[PDB]
């Protein structure tokens, strides 16, 4: 699976407000390892409608510097029948 | 919401073997109504790794004939960390 690298982050999005950035590679979501956007999505689905924090561990491009970001969930996608979890965070996967 | 219409079905896929066809509109998955491919995906995720039948109710293109198709699950995507549920059935969603 394509490694899960952020291609862009929408201004003022949940991801931006949490300090996620283009070029970061996701390594874990809510404490469980991820190695592709499909696995990311499975972790995101588990939190639909919830409030609290979504923990996203990432690594900077080209370094071993890891950081953990707390994305704010406030009834996140509550009531949505057709949610797009990754896009709703403001994240566009890098897909060259 | 963009109604969930099948764009293509790969030959010999799980969807093909169950009688699903391009042009059919999904109405329900495992008994629950769907109105877009994102909601379809939420229903598919619930069955990952399972065996039995995935019930897919569709409407024929241009008609009101509804039919229920039993897609065969045999350890479907068991263990896979990065599953693509819709694609794994052989289906490409139709895009406007």
Swiss-Prot record, chains A, B:
It is found in: Cell inner membrane. Belongs to the peptidase M50B family. This is Putative zinc metalloprotease PA3649. The lineage of its organism: Bacteria, Pseudomonadati, Pseudomonadota, Gammaproteobacteria, Pseudomonadales.
């Amino acid at each position: 699976s394509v490694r899960p690298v952020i291609g862009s982050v929408a201004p003022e999005s949940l991801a931006a407000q949490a300090g996620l950035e283009a070029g970061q590679e996701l390594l874990a979501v809510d404490g469980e390892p991820v190695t592709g956007w499909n696995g990311v999505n499975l972790q995101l689905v588990r939190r639909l409608g919830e409030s609290g924090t979504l923990e996203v561990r990432v690594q900077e491009k080209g370094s071993n510097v890891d950081s953990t970001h707390q994305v704010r969930l406030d009834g996140w996608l509550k009531g949505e029948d057709n949610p797009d979890p990754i896009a709703s965070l403001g994240i566009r996967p890098w897909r060259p």
